Amino acid sequence: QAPTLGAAANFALFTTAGAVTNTGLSHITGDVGTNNAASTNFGNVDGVMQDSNGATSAAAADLLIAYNLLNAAIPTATLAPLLGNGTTLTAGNYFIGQGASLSGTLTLDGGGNSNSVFIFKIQGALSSAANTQVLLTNGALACNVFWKVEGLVDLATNTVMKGNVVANNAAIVLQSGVSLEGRALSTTGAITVTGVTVRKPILCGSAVLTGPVAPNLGTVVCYTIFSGNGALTNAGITYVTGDVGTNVGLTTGFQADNVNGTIHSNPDTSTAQAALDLNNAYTYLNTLPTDIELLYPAAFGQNLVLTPHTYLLNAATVLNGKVTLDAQGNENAVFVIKINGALSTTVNASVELINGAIAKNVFWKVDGAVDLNDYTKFKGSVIGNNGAVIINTGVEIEGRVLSTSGGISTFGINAQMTPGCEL
Template sequence: MRLELSPPARSARPARTRPRLFAAAAVVTVGLLAIGAGPANAATTIDGPINLGTAAGYGVLAASAVTNTGATTINGDLGLSPESSVTGFPPGIVNGTQNVTNEPAALAQNDLLTAMGVASSLTPTTQGVGELTGLNLTPGVYSGGVISLSGNLTLTGTAESVWIFQAASRLDTFTGASIILAGGASACNVFWRVGSSATLDAGAPFVGTVLADTSISTGSGTVVEGRLLASTGAVTLINTVINRPTGCDDGSGSEVTTSPEITSAPLPGGTVGTTYDSTVTSTGSPDATYTVTSGALPPGLVLDSVTGGVTGTPTTPGTYTVTITASNGSAPDDSIESTIVIVPPGTPQVPGQPAVPAGDMTRLPDTGFQGSTLAIVAGSLLGLGLLAGIASVIVRRRRRDQLGG
């Protein structure tokens, strides 16, 4: 099942806008000839569970230590890397392999870091979640600061449905908390990405794989249908049962996609009879294709839908407004609008600046100043300055003559 995730509110990248008009005695600026449309918000999605790599086989994986008190049972592997402190087994039982400070444990930690990066990159369906008690959530990506659970949370979906919770700070569950899977939903596909530490309190049944930056701890009587994976800290267990999910899709076939975001400036102007070569570029995965969705390119120019290149030889002077859209199958698309001025042969141009038709005194391509206006204003100011100076000299001489007389 493919998750279609809506983008979060975020800071927009610098808008492509017209410059402001400054009024001054000798400076007159003009509008740009190429104007970009506002950017779309890129969204990163995944069409299946997160690929845990070799970390998928572990019920517990830690970096600094694994500590147990009491009758804990881990139905899955136990791993520790790079440190070597594993205590409390026995009395704890590991129904799997113990990999401590060895190559498999190090590889699992590397795979965990990759999985955490993917989980963090996904665009939330819902932002600002906190206390989850009483909610019935459909598949998606849910983000918040501290995420907590003190009562019942229901996850309703199918065996292919995926839930990803992004806690920027902590994950805390309390006595009386419970996660209910409905409609065929599977513990294989529930992931908790935690920015610091997770605490699963005493007696709280828990569902899903915890991917924590630092540490994870459980209270006595906690039952986990999932995995406890910590990338830099310890996993501390007290009388806990951990059942690593079995029969899961390992996520290796899941595709992470990022919607396109155009990174190039609006297309520049050109000259009739002169080869034109510019490119619309974008980020995103997979690569985008490009189409003209509004307006038209100047006659003689064509768009390469694969590379985004706009090439050819302009044949007709004029001003042409065109919108080019980048699409890669992951919403939203991104578009850029350009106003392309094509001028007759011999019209001066400055590299990197849009062309200006000959005789158009409203724009200067090199400075943006108004040519005739600048000359007139500058000349006027110079003339006024000379006249004022002459008048001042005449006045001083008259006063001196009067005093002398």
């Protein structure tokens, strides 16, 4: 059996004792923390910032247990300290009785068995040369790779690294552009990262993320652009699949032959029922418990990747460029993004879906105005509350844009509802 990390598994970056510091734009999936200080200068992290609390205390204890199992592992072979340079290794417990250095390419080959475990016992420091790459093949999984390092871990610029890097009574330093599918864990010592990507490995018994239970949209699943209260006005050449309308005021500017659906030119029984159902959905989304707070709403996007959870952005939010929603292979995964303020975007902003994520299962609860800037590619169901909506030239929506209250103005857009309507 590979060693369990217990609570330490929750983390991308963790030290039992010391400072945890970021510089520049880093992309992190997993908790970040220290059991005796507070991490500084991180941007948006897909994980909880855990500082000197019950979570870090638990991680500290389980990291110790993990370390001891690593230290107890009976070596299957000895390696020279120069690791990589085109070398391939199969499963084993590898003993290096001095400081080690990674260089060039190192391939870990699973032999067609995803249960293959690779443990490196480094009796000294571990360094890499710039542009070093650790590669996995033939079934090998990052969650089954471990480095037990008795000294400073220092990974050079653009190092591609795999596995759980456990530094015992030493610091970890991850230089510009390091990309780690794995974890940086210290039993005490500082962690310093600069412009890195670190994503905790999935599998090896990690719970499959589902996200929260999706709201029931009721009849508003059949609408694509809808206001509970306020004029709905389109200009330019716009195409819609699904219904459009307002429950208070007039809908104008949509050309019937461009709408695969019904334009409700003024309020009717359908808009009345949609308005009730929109309020119910908003209230449901608003009251879902927050899993992860994204601490920098002004900096949202910039190639942030999210996983199935309920997120809170606790201020007006700007989507700059791209945000990606990663279902991690679970097509039924739900993402809820609660925004406590207005939502606006840059031109060419985008929401992208990977690893099975579908727009039907993405929801945005926006407590304020919604403004989708020119040529934004937006996905999911946006439910705004008390604020005007503007959807600018060329915006593409796979999903819907709804407001409980507020006028809506659209300009030359293409908006197509996601599945659920049965009319």
